[PDB]
Amino acid sequence: PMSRAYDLVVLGAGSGGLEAGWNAAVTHKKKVAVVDVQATHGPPLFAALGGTCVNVGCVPKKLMVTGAQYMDLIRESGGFGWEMDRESLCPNWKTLIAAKNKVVNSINESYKSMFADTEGLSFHMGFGALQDAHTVVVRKSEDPHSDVLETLDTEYILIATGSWPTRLGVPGDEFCITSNEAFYLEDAPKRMLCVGGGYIAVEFAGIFNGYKPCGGYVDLCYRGDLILRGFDTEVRKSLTKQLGANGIRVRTNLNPTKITKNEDGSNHVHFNDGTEEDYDQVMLAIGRVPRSQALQLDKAGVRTGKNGAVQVDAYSKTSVDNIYAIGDVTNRVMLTPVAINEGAAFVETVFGGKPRATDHTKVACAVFSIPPIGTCGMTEEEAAKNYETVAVYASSFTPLMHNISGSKHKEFMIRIITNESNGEVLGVHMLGDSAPEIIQSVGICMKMGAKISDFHSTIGVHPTSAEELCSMRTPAYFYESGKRVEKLS
Amino acid sequence: PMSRAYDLVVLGAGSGGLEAGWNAAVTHKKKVAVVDVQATHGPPLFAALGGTCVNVGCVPKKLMVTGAQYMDLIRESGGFGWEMDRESLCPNWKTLIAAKNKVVNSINESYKSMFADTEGLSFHMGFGALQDAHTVVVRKSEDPHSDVLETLDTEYILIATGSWPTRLGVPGDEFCITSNEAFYLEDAPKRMLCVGGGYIAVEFAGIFNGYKPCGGYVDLCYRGDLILRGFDTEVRKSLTKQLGANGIRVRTNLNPTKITKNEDGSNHVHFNDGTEEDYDQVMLAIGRVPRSQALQLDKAGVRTGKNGAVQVDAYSKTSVDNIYAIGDVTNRVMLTPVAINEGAAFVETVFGGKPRATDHTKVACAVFSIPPIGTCGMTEEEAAKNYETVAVYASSFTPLMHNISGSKHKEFMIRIITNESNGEVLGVHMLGDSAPEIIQSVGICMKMGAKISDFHSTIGVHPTSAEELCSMRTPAYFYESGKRVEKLS
Ligand SMILES: Cc1cc2nc3c(=O)[nH]c(=O)nc-3n(C[C@H](O)[C@H](O)[C@H](O)COP(=O)(O)OP(=O)(O)OC[C@H]3O[C@@H](n4cnc5c(N)ncnc54)[C@H](O)[C@@H]3O)c2cc1C
Ligand SMILES: Cc1cc2nc3c(=O)[nH]c(=O)nc-3n(C[C@H](O)[C@H](O)[C@H](O)COP(=O)(O)OP(=O)(O)OC[C@H]3O[C@@H](n4cnc5c(N)ncnc54)[C@H](O)[C@@H]3O)c2cc1C
Ligand SMILES: C[n+]1nn(-c2ccc(-c3nc(CCc4ccccc4)cs3)c(OCCC3CCNCC3)c2)cc1CCCCN
Ligand SMILES: C[n+]1nn(-c2ccc(-c3nc(CCc4ccccc4)cs3)c(OCCC3CCNCC3)c2)cc1CCCCN
């Protein structure tokens, strides 16, 4: 019974939005309108058709991490007897950026193919904004007195506008770059300062390190004690050391007070401890907050709260019953396959009839550091609060192939966290090469409620780094009533 | 009640033997004697303390596969903008062999540390042989009229002498090398012929290819149709193509009739189709048979059969109740972590009191080809015989990073085999980089009896090759009553 122009309007053609949009349009034959600000990546808006992940997140970030490993792998080759010229070896950053752009640009092109070819699914380039719970407006600019391009009469609204990097707010904030501007840099920087301790800081530390032009260096500088908060505490310490030996100088309890410009265009940076220093480029990876701040949410009566977060029930529904919100705008788990799920399960809830919420517990996570981390489930810290008796299994070995390659800093590390009672696996925490591949399969096991029994009853694959999961039988130590004990009562 | 000199005599200090030996000695305080032919690796006996795996199998083989990838990874680097000299690039094979020997030799040294330091555990260098069910003899040579070094009065005997490469038996057999002689080659061969279609042929094809000195080439030559029998049929076809594009010429329905020597020391090789050709070195990887053929088994009354195989019940026990046999000598699954388990469960059976057999079904396997294979559980061929209704899920994608690297032949491939009835996962079959790491975790899931439900209910790790396990929902096709059908009745 056609009353409105569109069944669904989606603010943001991101990981969350596109999954919701596409499903609604092809599997339930709804008429869908998807709003985004631009159709291909790049400044000054960065995000585009495909979302943060495709244009300025996971996909480019990984392409450039893969680049920066070639440094560590061309060093490693010498031991296996690859003689070749190690004077004529610095990486050309322009060839990396050009290649990365060709790729992201191909994905943006393959999405316009999707819209023109898919029926009932339209793309509306501009700036989303609510008037009431059934009308979405598209402007030229986010300035609310801009020319209005379209008025989208609709039944349901899905807010999936994602998040945006937080600024430092000090004298000199406007001289620093972000995850956004890092991707379209013209030159790889000789002297680089990565402020922050989050996964993005550490991934980008490894890139700029890999692509430093000759006599260059990278300083990571984090305002706390130990990088990567709410990761396993021995994995963080082991990475902090391994970044050290790949060339990255890590500093802690350290915060920029001030950045002035310089003569040759470098950045003078004043710190906590008094210290000043010059860096070519300075990058802020200090958390990412929701983009609610220009959607005129207050106008159509949807609940805001912690940093603009769209306040939502388990089934992704806002304080207005026809308006829903998914992905980073909601501020739950800020990963791409989470948003995809939340959006897939929004379509099943609303249009599909088959109502479902998203599972947020024991989701497998990965850091594309050098070396990388895989993690799934809980730290031993938050285990020993929520569980009576906790076993901690732990194992750290160095692949023999590193006794050849020279890379003897590269410790591979596994930790398993247990409920003593029934032996259930609560957490798994890996560091070292191939950890992101291995954890994906572990994430399946912990969904089926795997016990430590099930790991060490499994015949191994020899020789592998993963075969050390099934050789962990004795707990290293325990927690009873959340206090660390040598051995169990 | 001490009646005999030793509780346990172990023929062969291999993967199986050492696990049995060590456990018996430290966890059950038995007096153990371990017999092997030499203490460090190398010709003319090759195997030594640590077994085939440590000296001339898995461990060296992987070190040298890791070497040969540096070829494909230095090519790949150029696209990510690693300018460097690609004239001055051939691999030095002597630096690889020297480095490999330093490693294997360190492991042999770390095992003599284990014997001198561990109590009740002695090492007896020579050639094992039964006199009766309670006496083992050690000779200088395998020639049964050799000088006798020791007479080991014992209660239990464990036969774990492993296996040995099969010869071709044609005019010219004694000119060809094997897995054994390949490891101690002086020069990497310009023109290499790998006869065979088994995992060892294909791993070693990739090595000799990686380390060919300049204008050199490798021919794989298999007497059948499609290499790697009893692997998934689309994975075999995909590898056959990818070996092709890494440089390896594969020939099929082809068997050497004759090898004569040559003038400059190369090998003239006559084939089925008439064809002759000269190769520097020619390697036989055409199956590996048990080493029973010199243990005087018939003398002490233990059951032989299929190619010398020691005929054994589920708990590893021979036709004589005090004699047991594990690992490749038994001719079950010829992998190292299998033998380790069979030996660990021999010690639990006999000395431990807690009797247990080894689980052989759904053991995860891996080929260190370039690119590598991970496999666990059954082919779709042997599924559709033993199961009424079978679903086959299948997915083949190319990581975007190969649109940069130039390696566009590198297809990553997953196949899942299902029981239609209950959705149980019977088999998993992967090809492409990191497949051996991923399958280890899958092997755990299929031990817990994982359904296809459990895979695609799991939030992904983005971006990963493994995340394509959890995005497989629609079966590609089915088998009902073991006949391939487009769609299900
Ligand atoms: C450097 C980096 C690396 C990352 N790496 C990973 C990783 O490895 N794995 C992982 O799982 N996640 C990763 N993430 C996170 C991932 O990118 C996000 O979690 C994911 O994109 C969230 O999906 P979404 O749809 O909620 O947001 P988005 O994909 O950001 O969707 C928001 C879209 O809406 C548009 N938009 C914003 N405001 C408006 C408006 N007013 N009108 C119209 N359109 C608008 C934006 O332009 C954008 O296209 C990374 C993020 C970054 C920054
Ligand atoms: C090239 C190659 C690659 C391989 N790769 C892998 C792999 O990646 N993964 C995997 O799981 N498996 C692999 N294998 C198989 C693995 O090496 C064997 O399955 C494993 O070693 C079997 O253990 P075992 O104890 O039965 O035999 P072994 O380890 O061979 O033990 C036999 C030992 O007994 C000794 N011996 C023999 N006769 C006598 C005698 N009369 N008296 C005394 N001692 C004697 C031998 O010298 C040897 O030390 C590979 C094999 C080869 C050849
Ligand atoms: C006509 N037509 N075009 N397309 C169509 C066309 C395209 C895509 C994609 N392209 C990329 C770019 C990846 C890349 C490939 C090669 C090189 C670089 C990048 C991602 S996804 C697509 O997405 C289906 C899954 C979805 C998509 C939305 N997210 C959810 C999943 C559907 C499909 C149809 C048939 C539909 C009939 C209409 N009723
Ligand atoms: C005194 N002492 N020495 N050792 C002792 C000493 C050594 C080893 C090994 N060394 C390697 C070499 C690997 C390498 C390391 C570094 C560089 C290259 C190679 C493998 S394993 C060892 O194996 C314990 C598990 C077993 C072993 C048998 N297979 C089964 C598992 C026990 C141990 C003790 C205490 C025992 C007290 C005696 N009652």
Side-chain angles (χ1 to χ4, degrees):
Chain A
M2 65 170 60
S3 78
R4 300 182 177 282
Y6 301 104
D7 279 290
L8 179 59
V9 168
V10 183
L11 282 65
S15 295
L18 278 185
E19 184 73 32
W22 165 269
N23 285 321
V26 312
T27 59
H28 304 82
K29 306 291 169 179
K30 298 290 154 170
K31 214 202 166 178
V32 181
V34 186
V35 185
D36 211 303
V37 304
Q38 70 177 24
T40 53
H41 66 312
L45 295 140
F46 300 109
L49 196 64
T52 288
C53 57
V54 166
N55 300 294
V56 291
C58 63
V59 176
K61 170 221 68 199
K62 170 138 194 223
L63 289 177
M64 296 173 73
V65 167
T66 321
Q69 280 157 12
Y70 285 114
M71 192 188 60
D72 303 31
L73 282 165
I74 288 172
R75 183 179 45 87
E76 278 179 25
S77 74
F80 293 90
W82 294 86
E83 278 123 54
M84 40 152 292
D85 201 26
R86 302 275 158 70
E87 320 321 319
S88 163
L89 179 73
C90 39
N92 177 228
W93 165 277
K94 260 167 192 65
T95 35
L96 166 69
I97 295 300
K100 177 229 83 179
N101 291 326
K102 189 170 191 202
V103 160
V104 167
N105 211 299
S106 103
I107 300 163
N108 291 143
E109 285 304 301
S110 92
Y111 273 132
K112 281 172 293 198
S113 292
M114 186 187 91
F115 277 93
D117 285 19
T118 298
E119 191 187 66
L121 181 65
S122 38
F123 171 60
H124 305 257
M125 202 180 75
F127 273 88
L130 279 59
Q131 301 297 284
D132 53 44
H134 289 106
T135 304
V136 163
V137 160
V138 184
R139 279 142 196 167
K140 274 183 160 107
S141 155
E142 65 271 45
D143 176 78
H145 323 274
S146 298
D147 286 348
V148 182
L149 296 179
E150 312 185 54
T151 298
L152 307 190
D153 179 36
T154 188
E155 274 209 12
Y156 293 86
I157 295 172
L158 182 59
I159 311 190
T161 44
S163 62
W164 195 247
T166 327
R167 281 278 169 173
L168 203 60
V170 305
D173 179 55
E174 81 276 20
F175 297 83
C176 309
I177 77 178
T178 49
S179 42
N180 290 343
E181 289 96 47
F183 286 120
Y184 307 93
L185 265 181
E186 52 292 340
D187 298 285
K190 194 168 240 310
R191 302 170 290 145
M192 165 49 75
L193 175 49
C194 283
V195 186
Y199 80 101
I200 293 189
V202 180
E203 283 161 345
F204 267 97
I207 297 168
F208 286 129
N209 185 43
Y211 276 94
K212 66 202 171 187
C214 320
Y217 59 90
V218 182
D219 291 349
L220 210 154
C221 151
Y222 167 55
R223 92 159 172 72
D225 263 33
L226 186 53
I227 68 182
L228 284 164
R229 292 183 63 243
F231 284 82
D232 173 280
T233 297
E234 295 313 320
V235 165
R236 292 155 70 181
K237 280 204 247 180
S238 184
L239 184 64
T240 290
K241 260 196 52 150
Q242 287 193 53
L243 289 173
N246 271 320
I248 298 155
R249 189 198 181 210
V250 192
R251 293 136 87 195
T252 54
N253 305 292
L254 209 54
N255 221 332
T257 59
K258 169 175 177 168
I259 309 97
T260 45
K261 211 61 207 207
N262 217 65
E263 292 82 353
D264 92 332
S266 58
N267 302 131
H268 203 55
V269 185
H270 305 246
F271 288 107
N272 280 147
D273 58 356
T275 308
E276 293 160 351
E277 204 194 335
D278 282 76
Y279 301 98
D280 291 18
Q281 215 71 263
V282 178
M283 166 159 161
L284 305 185
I286 58 155
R288 287 178 50 87
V289 306
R291 305 188 87 171
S292 49
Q293 300 295 345
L295 296 181
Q296 280 173 202
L297 292 192
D298 61 320
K299 166 155 261 215
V302 296
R303 194 54 57 130
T304 306
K306 287 297 186 279
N307 281 355
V310 174
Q311 300 287 102
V312 156
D313 71 26
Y315 293 74
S316 297
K317 191 171 86 79
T318 57
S319 48
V320 183
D321 318 81
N322 66 295
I323 305 181
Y324 284 65
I326 62 171
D328 306 3
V329 76
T330 68
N331 198 350
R332 302 181 254 185
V333 199
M334 283 184 288
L335 304 177
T336 278
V338 173
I340 272 167
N341 196 253
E342 277 172 11
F346 151 80
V347 167
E348 297 176 46
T349 299
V350 168
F351 302 113
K354 313 289 200 192
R356 179 175 67 84
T358 290
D359 203 322
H360 293 276
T361 66
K362 37 185 77 183
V363 48
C365 177
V367 189
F368 291 89
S369 42
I370 324 181
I373 288 152
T375 195
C376 181
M378 54 187 89
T379 55
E380 72 187 76
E381 277 80 26
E382 89 172 293
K385 290 182 281 170
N386 287 31
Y387 285 82
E388 169 93 329
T389 321
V390 183
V392 164
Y393 298 72
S395 166
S396 301
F397 65 106
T398 288
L400 290 169
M401 57 153 284
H402 288 316
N403 300 349
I404 298 174
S405 89
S407 292
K408 293 190 311 198
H409 60 281
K410 294 202 189 194
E411 200 181 60
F412 192 92
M413 175 171 293
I414 309 166
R415 297 172 79 76
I416 302 148
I417 292 69
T418 291
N419 185 36
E420 170 66 3
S421 274
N422 62 328
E424 190 185 20
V425 169
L426 306 177
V428 168
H429 304 279
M430 316 209 315
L431 167 72
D433 293 287
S434 269
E437 312 292 311
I438 288 163
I439 205 77
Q440 175 65 279
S441 319
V442 168
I444 295 172
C445 297
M446 298 175 58
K447 201 53 137 218
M448 306 158 67
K451 299 175 183 182
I452 192 63
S453 292
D454 296 342
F455 283 25
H456 73 74
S457 97
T458 298
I459 309 284
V461 188
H462 194 78
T464 294
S465 281
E467 64 158 356
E468 193 46 38
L469 279 164
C470 321
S471 308
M472 283 170 83
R473 289 171 201 78
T474 290
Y477 60 98
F478 307 75
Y479 289 100
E480 27 181 30
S481 302
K483 214 198 80 199
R484 193 192 183 285
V485 301
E486 72 280 344
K487 180 172 57 165
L488 197 62
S489 163
Chain B
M2 65 170 60
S3 78
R4 300 182 177 282
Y6 301 104
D7 279 290
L8 179 59
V9 168
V10 183
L11 282 65
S15 295
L18 278 185
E19 184 73 32
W22 165 269
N23 285 321
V26 312
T27 59
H28 304 82
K29 306 291 169 179
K30 298 290 154 170
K31 214 202 166 178
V32 181
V34 186
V35 185
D36 211 303
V37 304
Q38 70 177 24
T40 53
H41 66 312
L45 295 140
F46 300 109
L49 196 64
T52 288
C53 57
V54 166
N55 300 294
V56 291
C58 63
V59 176
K61 170 221 68 199
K62 170 138 194 223
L63 289 177
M64 296 173 73
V65 167
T66 321
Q69 280 157 12
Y70 285 114
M71 192 188 60
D72 303 31
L73 282 165
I74 288 172
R75 183 179 45 87
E76 278 179 25
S77 74
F80 293 90
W82 294 86
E83 278 123 54
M84 40 152 292
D85 201 26
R86 302 275 158 70
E87 320 321 319
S88 163
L89 179 73
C90 39
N92 177 228
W93 165 277
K94 260 167 192 65
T95 35
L96 166 69
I97 295 300
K100 177 229 83 179
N101 291 326
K102 189 170 191 202
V103 160
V104 167
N105 211 299
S106 103
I107 300 163
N108 291 143
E109 285 304 301
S110 92
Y111 273 132
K112 281 172 293 198
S113 292
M114 186 187 91
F115 277 93
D117 285 19
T118 298
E119 191 187 66
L121 181 65
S122 38
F123 171 60
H124 305 257
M125 202 180 75
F127 273 88
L130 279 59
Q131 301 297 284
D132 53 44
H134 289 106
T135 304
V136 163
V137 160
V138 184
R139 279 142 196 167
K140 274 183 160 107
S141 155
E142 65 271 45
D143 176 78
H145 323 274
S146 298
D147 286 348
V148 182
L149 296 179
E150 312 185 54
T151 298
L152 307 190
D153 179 36
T154 188
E155 274 209 12
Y156 293 86
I157 295 172
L158 182 59
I159 311 190
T161 44
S163 62
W164 195 247
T166 327
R167 281 278 169 173
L168 203 60
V170 305
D173 179 55
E174 81 276 20
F175 297 83
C176 309
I177 77 178
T178 49
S179 42
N180 290 343
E181 289 96 47
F183 286 120
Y184 307 93
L185 265 181
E186 52 292 340
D187 298 285
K190 194 168 240 310
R191 302 170 290 145
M192 165 49 75
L193 175 49
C194 283
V195 186
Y199 80 101
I200 293 189
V202 180
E203 283 161 345
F204 267 97
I207 297 168
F208 286 129
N209 185 43
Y211 276 94
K212 66 202 171 187
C214 320
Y217 59 90
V218 182
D219 291 349
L220 210 154
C221 151
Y222 167 55
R223 92 159 172 72
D225 263 33
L226 186 53
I227 68 182
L228 284 164
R229 292 183 63 243
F231 284 82
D232 173 280
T233 297
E234 295 313 320
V235 165
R236 292 155 70 181
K237 280 204 247 180
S238 184
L239 184 64
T240 290
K241 260 196 52 150
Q242 287 193 53
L243 289 173
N246 271 320
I248 298 155
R249 189 198 181 210
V250 192
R251 293 136 87 195
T252 54
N253 305 292
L254 209 54
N255 221 332
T257 59
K258 169 175 177 168
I259 309 97
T260 45
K261 211 61 207 207
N262 217 65
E263 292 82 353
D264 92 332
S266 58
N267 302 131
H268 203 55
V269 185
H270 305 246
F271 288 107
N272 280 147
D273 58 356
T275 308
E276 293 160 351
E277 204 194 335
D278 282 76
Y279 301 98
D280 291 18
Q281 215 71 263
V282 178
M283 166 159 161
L284 305 185
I286 58 155
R288 287 178 50 87
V289 306
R291 305 188 87 171
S292 49
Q293 300 295 345
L295 296 181
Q296 280 173 202
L297 292 192
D298 61 320
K299 166 155 261 215
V302 296
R303 194 54 57 130
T304 306
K306 287 297 186 279
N307 281 355
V310 174
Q311 300 287 102
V312 156
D313 71 26
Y315 293 74
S316 297
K317 191 171 86 79
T318 57
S319 48
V320 183
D321 318 81
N322 66 295
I323 305 181
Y324 284 65
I326 62 171
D328 306 3
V329 76
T330 68
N331 198 350
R332 302 181 254 185
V333 199
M334 283 184 288
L335 304 177
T336 278
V338 173
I340 272 167
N341 196 253
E342 277 172 11
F346 151 80
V347 167
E348 297 176 46
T349 299
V350 168
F351 302 113
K354 313 289 200 192
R356 179 175 67 84
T358 290
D359 203 322
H360 293 276
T361 66
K362 37 185 77 183
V363 48
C365 177
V367 189
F368 291 89
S369 42
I370 324 181
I373 288 152
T375 195
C376 181
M378 54 187 89
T379 55
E380 72 187 76
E381 277 80 26
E382 89 172 293
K385 290 182 281 170
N386 287 31
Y387 285 82
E388 169 93 329
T389 321
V390 183
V392 164
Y393 298 72
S395 166
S396 301
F397 65 106
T398 288
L400 290 169
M401 57 153 284
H402 288 316
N403 300 349
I404 298 174
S405 89
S407 292
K408 293 190 311 198
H409 60 281
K410 294 202 189 194
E411 200 181 60
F412 192 92
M413 175 171 293
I414 309 166
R415 297 172 79 76
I416 302 148
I417 292 69
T418 291
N419 185 36
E420 170 66 3
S421 274
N422 62 328
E424 190 185 20
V425 169
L426 306 177
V428 168
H429 304 279
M430 316 209 315
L431 167 72
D433 293 287
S434 269
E437 312 292 311
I438 288 163
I439 205 77
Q440 175 65 279
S441 319
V442 168
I444 295 172
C445 297
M446 298 175 58
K447 201 53 137 218
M448 306 158 67
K451 299 175 183 182
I452 192 63
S453 292
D454 296 342
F455 283 25
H456 73 74
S457 97
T458 298
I459 309 284
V461 188
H462 194 78
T464 294
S465 281
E467 64 158 356
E468 193 46 38
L469 279 164
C470 321
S471 308
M472 283 170 83
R473 289 171 201 78
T474 290
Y477 60 98
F478 307 75
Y479 289 100
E480 27 181 30
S481 302
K483 214 198 80 199
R484 193 192 183 285
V485 301
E486 72 280 344
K487 180 172 57 165
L488 197 62
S489 163

